[model samples]
Target: QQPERGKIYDRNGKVLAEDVERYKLVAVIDKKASANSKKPRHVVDKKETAKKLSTVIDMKPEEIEKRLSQKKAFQIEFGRKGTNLTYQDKLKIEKMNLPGISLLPETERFYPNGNFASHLIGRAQKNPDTGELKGALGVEKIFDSYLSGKRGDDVHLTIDSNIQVFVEEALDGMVERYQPKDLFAVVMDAKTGEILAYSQRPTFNPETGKDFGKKWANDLYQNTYEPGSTFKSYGLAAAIQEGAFDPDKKYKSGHRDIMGSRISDWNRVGWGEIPMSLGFTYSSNTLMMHLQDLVGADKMKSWYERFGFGKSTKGMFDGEAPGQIGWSNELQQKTSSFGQSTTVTPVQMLQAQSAFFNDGNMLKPWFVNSVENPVSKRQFYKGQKQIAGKPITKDTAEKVEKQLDLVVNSKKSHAANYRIDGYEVEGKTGTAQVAAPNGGGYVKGPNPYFVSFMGDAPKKNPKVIVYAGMSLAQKNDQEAYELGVSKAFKPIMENTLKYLNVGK
Candidate 1:
């Protein structure tokens, strides 16, 4: 007996993954009748039966004849192409009504969206002995007991299907155009930290499990990378929280020597002496180095921890890697200020960033909205919003938000491409070097940087926060990554805010 697996639904009750009707074609051959030379009770007229079946299935007529004529076997099944026959296909074959042919009723996991949220919803396989469906990956794997054990218990997610569709379409378009090595984007509710739409390129279809190798792991929570300049905004927040930042304070841009190591801006050409605000707008690494000195390494480490670094956000997803942020070394501390030395996963960045939009309160990230018992009509579990930490005061968070606003609106900003009409977007852009595969230093090339943008809208009252990153594989593709992320982020942010009815 096959175990009935629970269904998975979005917050709005759209099916994501579930068991659906399926059928297979089978033939039973009675050997005794054929051996007696009397009228065969089963599989009579083997040649005719094989010839008829060949037209209905994709198999060759001669091959079916060979299998049906076999005396060693009492039954036979068409290989690959014969399995998982669609209802309509089954109907077409059944119309033939061959003597021994029969339909094998079965249930197969179905994903209506194909590639939608594949990493999160995951696929399932049946246990050979018990005939029970078991989770293979993602929520299907993590919540297997709840989903497969209690037949009527269903898992509901915080994801909004409408928003998910928007995200998937946008990311698909980006992948078609840019062809980045990897890409990921997340849309989250600022007030509640509910993940609305989470998508990644190079994803696979959970139903077919095609490209399983490429799609098995989720980059959003599992892979970590140097956050580059996007991490700078949080560093600025730490500076403000520590009372070490002044917007009007002047600093030199371009190349700066810190304890004998040379640090330079992206252009390596100084913008002369500029105010701290311009340094941030320009994403000046030198200025970040200066700020690091002011904040102190010990103090900076504390701020990183406060903002959910060097730890997981308790997102409840399987295989979540808590990013690395070692600040013991002098160079590490300085470069970390500019988002170089420390590594961070996309979800971790999103979680930490909630502090900026939510007045310094970082909300824990979650996807499961609840689990329910369909038979009893009672909820097994319901998700709750909880604060992860208050890394800074509301005033300091607002201050950093204002500075980040310039990174999108100001003329000197590198992220000017991120602007959305009518909405005041507060955000930052990042370009960090990719680590060499050998693990000693960064890959040396023209486009070995990971470019990303983290932002939220309507300034004072944000309803959604977005984080997008693209890993580049070619030379001078910063613009490509930027354009790709902008194209993807704009629609995701705009539609989600509109869906939530958060006005400009």
Candidate 2:
């Protein structure tokens, strides 16, 4: 009879690594192998095995021994040299003829890329007691049941493997070149929520144990930051939902110096009473704040909550925090409408923004594209899944998107990178001054701030929407780089859209 084998595949049918059953040098620990006294010994002298194993595997011999001698254990298993092991490690334990020691046929798990996509895929953690390849984060943790073959074999959802190398290269280059304080990027199917490419700078390598610490604090799902203008899409949607904004109708725009706050045009100078379309073209914070106020804080908050905020996304990773919702306080309501006193995870923003492009239909934001049933060789996915809500109407979403178009291509001051060929993109740019070093005070001179932009392509029928954000200000107590001074938003956004083939 053929021994059982686990199934595996890449998003595009590229085999990374897989598990297979083969005879291994394992010790079942006695004729009956009592659970209390019986000990499983793959290696007789763990110290010697550790010594030999270290020569092949990077882990110390002591670590390997520690894993083996968990207790006065039961049956244990071990791998010999070569046999789909990837490592050409030969363990000549035949010399140590320990009685219970025998080559027992067993299954093993394997990963082709030791460190590739470590963070997004997450490191497999041993139960310590079980030593199983358990899921912890990324697609692995999210779809552990499918990957681990609770049914029979594992399956991949899409063509992720073919482009994985390129995806890694692009993301790696970005991380190395920018050395961002914190950053992450993902690529997904336009019509479906399937993630084709996903990566984060601060990642942990299960094999090497070389993790990107500190930076992991801004983990993909836990950390939340002010989205700046990237959130304007939601603001526009909220207004349209509340019947407050009319694209065909006009609204007078001017700077408002009230509420102990000042909302101005991008230039900080008045734009002389423009219409709502022009207001968006200029990214008039004053106008936007006015619209949000008209829509009312309660209504705006309701939209955000309904779109799935203030709740966990139930991501594969632990502690995937929800977007922070503001209370009904006066300042909370005002600042939140402008993307302040409010925060959202990058994943949340990306998922929520889809409502505009998908005819006001939000999705559950699926990272794993398809699950190939290891046993049946079948596949399942919800990439085209729609999250229903009454946040806004399709008419409102479309018109709001149109006005956003001018926000990018029309604005000479900030929309530099958005002027790509053959596409009319719509987005909003936000440059929010960071709180002072003293914690509630404002910074002087060039403002310390966060900048972001969110947009979609083909204007008429968006295949995908992209949201990018970065924190910038003066560093080393010196004058800031022009790019660091809220000037890099357009270039960052434009380059990404181009690379994705969304904008020419």
Candidate 3:
């Protein structure tokens, strides 16, 4: 007897993926001579059988008819259109009682929940040479040997289905509105660093295998980008820790000439002379340039590494890609300060930002919670709460969170655009330009900017950290892309924290 593939489940014991015996529908078109000729062994009415199956199998009546009409074939099967059917689908067709319709048994791995968390659960397709199901991607690929166990051991992840649903709701809505080039988000337990929810748009459906080729890269860890103003929090925090920054200090915003290149704030004209703190809330590039000058390139690089940049986070997914750290020149140093010259993955960002929310102790972001063999009671592994690093003091973290609050609390602040009722949410927004592949300043036309936001709720003592990013493709006029991030991030942070009952 062939063993079943291991199951994948959410922490709540809700099944996500499992192994099942599915059937392929085949129609016997050629009848054989039998003792009882009255018995119906072959397709009596090909048209009728084809028509009825069209409703369930997603094939045209004529298309299914053509398959049944093959002359030399003993039986006809609906190619890729009808294979690995659900029990309900098989029964639905079976109940029709159509003559000559027989189901062929085929055991396969199944993800019952259509496209929900599709990329995370992943797919295990049959290998033609080996004639066995093999893990191709996602969790399935990471723990293939265990998943292909003798007795089919089950794997449980840290993800809460309810929380995952909440995160996807925002992602779905964001796509409905902007149809961004790319979008992704991750919600993590600030204290423990367990990934509660994660998703990205253009995600593949394991059932249909759609978008698999285009979306093979997992945005949470595999793709990296300049994090824009969201990165300023790190630089600001580092400066404050080093006693190099004073929020009350005055600065002229709008545009700053750095290494002979003029860089302007989102508002090109200027904010005139304002306190450096206000400059932060306003997200002035000029202020960041000044801060980088004061902090020096060496300290900034150290802080970046300390915050988990330029290194693989080594989350449960082996697909994690360590982003690049760049500061080769004066221009690179200045731009890195404001989050332009450097790159960081979404998972890396989530891990780094957990520091502020978790009182300066950065936690390693993870997904798999447990894996075990139910038969022999063999516990292969269990997720443990590990403190990844202590990158800052509690005092610095408190000050950072409080200062970040200004980005949300004030009416004039950018984060004020997003409000979480019954709770004070603190967050930072990012608007980074996407560099052109061939060369030049940046790309234009559809997607010119990568907008992002990272936020935490009940700001005094944060419970959850939500990070979201979007690639905006506006043709002409420029609207604030950060709103795309907030529109998605706000609901996720608000709904998740509220769901956890952390309020006021």
Which candidate number would show the highest lDDT if scored against the true structure?
A: 1
Report the C-alpha lDDT of model 2 over 376-458, residue by residue, as the tens digit.
65656433454644466788768877776667666444565544455566556666655454868645555456655665665
Q: If both were scored by TM-score, which would come out higher, candidate 1 or candidate 2? A: 1
Global Cα RMSD, each model:
2.4, 7.4, 2.6
Q: How high is the lDDT of residue 418 in model 1?
A: 81
Worst 10-residue lDDT window for candidate 2 reads 476-485
Candidate 1 lDDT by residue in tens digits, 21-88: 78877887875645755645477778888888887788888899887776777778887777778998
Model 3's lDDT to the true fold?
0.81
Give the alpha carbon lDDT tens digit for every residue of 187-231 in model 3: 888888888998888798887777776778888878878888788
Candidate 3 Cα outliers beyond 4 Å, as residue runs: 31-40, 44-62, 88-99, 127-131, 252-254, 474-482
Residue 493's lDDT in candidate 3? 85
Query: Once all C-alphas are superposed, what RMSD does model 3 give against the true structure?
Result: 2.6
Better of 1 and 3 by TM-score: 1
TM-score of each: 0.93, 0.70, 0.92
Ranking by TM-score: 1, 3, 2
